[PDB]
Every structure is written in C-alpha cells, then in structure tokens.
Design a protein around this ligand. Structure first.
Ligand SMILES: *[C@@H]1O[C@H](CO)[C@@H](O)[C@H](O)[C@H]1NC(C)=O
Lengths: 441, 52
C-alpha cells in the first residue's frame, strides 16, 4: 500500500503520518532524516602550495667566460655575471682581475611541506543528493539506510520501498570553482592551470601532488653577486599560497546559508534545510490489521489543559472517549497547527487519555485522529518567557498563527464598520433615486 | 601532520533579550568570533577580539 506525501527538508524533526487503508487499522508512519548530503561532481584542476627555490652551485670560470643554456625547469633563471673576483677561505679564487665569469642558476620546485600543506583547486558541477532516513511504522522498530534523493531510485528499508523525491529547490552552496585547504572549503575563483600570476594564489600549480610537470610563475630574478663573494643572490615574489593563507577570509564552512555543514570525503554540503522533499513509501500488507481486530472509538471530547506556544512540546490536552475492543490506538494530527508527541495510546473500554503537542498558534484549533475517528481540540496558549533556546522549533508558523481573538475582533469591527458605512451610503443613494423617480411618476 | 594543543578562550557570559544574543567576551589572546544565521540569508560575522 503506497503512501505519498511531502516532508520538510529538516534533520532531527520527524515527519509523522497515518497510512489509512479502509477496512484496516491505520498504520502510523514516521520518517526522520538523519542527514542530508549535497554531493556535487568535482574535478581536481591543480594543486598549489608554497614553492621552494633550488639554487645549484654557480659556475665560476676564471680567466674566461661562459654562456647560459635554457633548461626544462619551472621558472628557470640563468644569468652570467662577468668581471667577478671572488674569494674563498683559501684566498682569491681566480687569477685574472676582470676576466673572470660567474654563471648563476635558479629554478622553482615544490617545497617539502607541499606533501602535507597544499590547497586543491576543484571545478564543481551539479552532482547528486543523498540522505540517510530513519523509518519506523506500525509495530516495526526503527530502520535506516542511505537513499538517493532523486525521486527515481527506491530504497528497501524494513520491507518498505522508500522513494525520496528530488529537493524542491536545486540549491547548492558551492560555486563553479572551489578551493579545499585542510578541512576548509572556499568559493575562490582560482586562475586556470598555466595562467597563474606571481604572488597570487595560483603562482605555483601542479596537476597532482606527485606530478613531475610543475608550473611556476614568480618574479625570480638573479642578482649580481656581492663583490668578492661566491653565492647566488636573487629576488622573488613572496609565495602567493602563503599570502592566500593570510587573505583566505571566512571559509564556506562558516558562511554557507541554511546552516550547511561542509565535509570533504567526498566534498559535500550536509544538513542544508532548503525547501521540501516529496516522498513515497510502499508498506507491505503484513503491517495492516483489520479493523474488526482493533479498537474503535466514539463520543470523543478533547480538552486542552495547558499550552505555551514555545518551541518545545509546551501543549497538553486530554481526550475523553468510549471504545469497543479496547486496545492500543494510533494518534495523529493531520493539520500543521500542532505537532503531537505521542504516536499511540492504550485504550480501555471507557476513560480518557492525554497527549502533548507543540504549536505556534495563540488559539490552536486542530483535528486529532484516533483509530479512524476525529476530534477537534480548541484552547488558548500563553507566550513563553525564555527569549533564546538551544533547540529548533518543532511546530511551523503561518500568517494567522499569531492573530489573537482580540485582534480578529478589531479586524472584524474595522472591516465590518467601513463596509457597513459604504453600504449605508449606497442604500441611501439607491433610495433617493427611487424617491425621485416617484416624484416624476 | 601532528596534533598540537591550542588554547581555549574563557567561556562567554550569555545574556538573553528578545531576539537578541548578548555575549560578554573576555579573551586571553586575540580570539576569533564568527556568527551566521541559519536561514536563507546567512549574514556572516567575522571579528578578532583582543580585549573584553
Ligand atoms: C533511529 O532512531 C532511533 C530512535 O531511538 C535511534 O536509536 C537510531 O539510532 C536512529 N538511527 C540512526 C541511523 O540514527
């Protein structure tokens, strides 16, 4: 027996409903999301990290000269400095005073830290949505499984075939390009591979952390050695990866809307409370007991004894009843006015039972289903005194939830008063025309 | 990769008003405070607090 509905995209707040099959006792159904995961399709573009400048031993040619040869090294530099007269611990290195030459070389390579301290540049595309759903129904205990939130793939959870529809809003916190660093994810528009600029995030780029083909773009310039000294001085733009670390700003972990959590294995946004989720669950015939074998109730009377429209279950009500074939009975509230804490009650041949509920309404009025029967509960609720709480609201707001009977009275008096005044003017207008007509005739 | 011991700032004093969260922050070191709402418009806040 298939039951179809739409449940809010909320984690930790269950969707509760009765599966009503004429001739059989209603099966109470409860579907709770354990987590919701938005898993985009990602493609690693390149890996950037802090660079290391490799400086081989310079070639010092005494009484002669050398020429630079281009080499296949990242950001390779080579310059020949003539007219050098270097000294070592053993004295002057060269004999000639001005005919000596020093060749300096330098190139960029990944630092040792790049194996543990690097940022991954990903291109992000629309992917899939998954969730873990906790389901209980009838007398069946809680069962859970990972499902695909696409409305097409059925999940079998405890002999029930669950199809969770696509999210009503195709929203994702990830932009087209993101940077993953450590546990953090950033919506950073990084330069494409091979186009990085010195001092910026992508100055050093590698397709993989173990790739042998490295791209480097720094203003690495060889400087002339100090007089009499054998060394290879140079200037270079400070690493843009270390610069980015300072200018990262807030990560997506800390700014994502809808309370999303960002996980990395795989990269995904979790528990984003966006929109609603269509659902469809097919419950086997074994779960449905014939009405003739279950209790039924009549002459129901509901009393709300206490109520606060707090986020918690601040409402309390009592239902008087008469029944036949006394036994366990499911409880449900079809409307959104109040969320019922209880799932079922134990009935006697006669008596009453109590239940707790959460409502945002000042004057809640809602239908309570009891073994295919229904009773209307009405009462007034006081406001809570606690300004801030550490838990989410169980109930749902509406336009008219906050309008009190006194406010409705003023609205009715205002609208009725103005309408009656206009009607009075129109009746007077109609009568005077009728009187004038009789003057002529 | 290794595990390092980082400091813990003193727990804030929290005062509640209608739709307002009041935090009294007394850090020992420059401490980062960030906030965001859980709605469709998460207005983020990011500030380093060095003094009470
Ligand atoms: C399902 O809900 C029950 C409630 O008692 C809980 O014990 C169980 O751990 C939940 N399942 C998951 C996967 O969280």
């Amino acid at each position: 027996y298939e039951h179809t509905a739409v449940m809010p995209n909320k984690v930790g707040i269950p969707y509760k409903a009765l599966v009503e099959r004429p001739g059989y006792a209603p099966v109470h159904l409860q579907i709770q999301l354990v987590n919701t995961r938005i898993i985009p399709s990602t493609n690693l573009e390149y890996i950037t990290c802090k660079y290391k400048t490799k400086v081989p031993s310079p070639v010092v040619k005494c009484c002669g000269a050398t020429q630079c040869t281009s080499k296949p090294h990242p950001d390779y530099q080579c310059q020949v400095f003539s007219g050098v007269y270097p000294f070592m611990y053993g004295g002057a290195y060269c004999f000639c005073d001005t005919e000596n030459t020093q060749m300096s070389e330098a190139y960029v390579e990944r630092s040792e830290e790049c194996s543990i301290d690097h940022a991954k540049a990903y291109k992000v595309h629309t992917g899939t949505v998954q969730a873990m759903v906790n389901i209980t129904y009838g007398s069946v205990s809680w069962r859970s499984a990972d499902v695909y939130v696409n409305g097409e793939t059925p999940a079998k959870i405890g002999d029930a075939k669950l199809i969770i529809g696509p999210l009503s809003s195709a929203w994702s916190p990830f932009d087209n390009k993101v940077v993953v660093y450590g546990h953090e994810v950033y919506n950073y528009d990084f330069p494409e591979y091979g186009t990085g600029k010195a001092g910026s995030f992508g100055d050093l780029q590698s397709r993989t952390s173990t790739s042998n083909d490295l791209y480097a773009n720094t203003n690495l310039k060889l400087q002339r050695p100090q007089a009499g000294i054998v060394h290879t001085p140079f200037t270079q733009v400070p690493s843009g990866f270390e610069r980015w670390k300072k200018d990262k700003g807030a990560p997506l972990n800390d700014v994502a809307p809808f309370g999303c959590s960002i996980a990395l294995e795989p990269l995904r946004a979790e528990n984003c409370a966006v929109g609603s989720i269509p659902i469809s669950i097919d419950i086997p015939d074994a779960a449905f007991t014939r009405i003739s074998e279950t209790p039924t109730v009549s002459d129901l009377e509901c009393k709300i004894t206490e109520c606060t429209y707090a986020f918690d279950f601040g409402g309390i009500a009592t239902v008087a009843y008469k029944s036949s074939k006394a036994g366990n009975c499911p409880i449900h509230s079809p409307s959104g006015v109040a969320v019922i804490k209880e799932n079922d009650v134990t009935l006697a041949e006669s008596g009453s039972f109590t239940f707790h509920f959460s409502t945002a309404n000042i004057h809640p009025a809602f239908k309570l289903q009891v073994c295919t029967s229904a009773v209307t509960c009405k009462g007034d609720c006081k406001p809570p005194k606690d300004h801030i709480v550490d838990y989410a609201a169980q109930h749902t707001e509406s336009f008219t939830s906050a309008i009190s009977a006194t406010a409705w009275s003023w609205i009715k008096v205002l609208v009725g008063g103005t309408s009656a005044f206009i009607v009075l003017g129109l009746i007077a207008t109609a009568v005077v025309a009728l009187v004038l007509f009789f003057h002529r005739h | 990769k290794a595990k390092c011991i980082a400091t813990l700032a003193p727990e804030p004093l929290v005062e509640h008003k209608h739709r307002t969260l009041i935090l009294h922050l007394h850090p020992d070191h420059p401490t980062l405070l960030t906030t965001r709402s859980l709605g469709s418009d998460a207005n983020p806040t990011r500030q380093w607090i060095e003094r009470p």
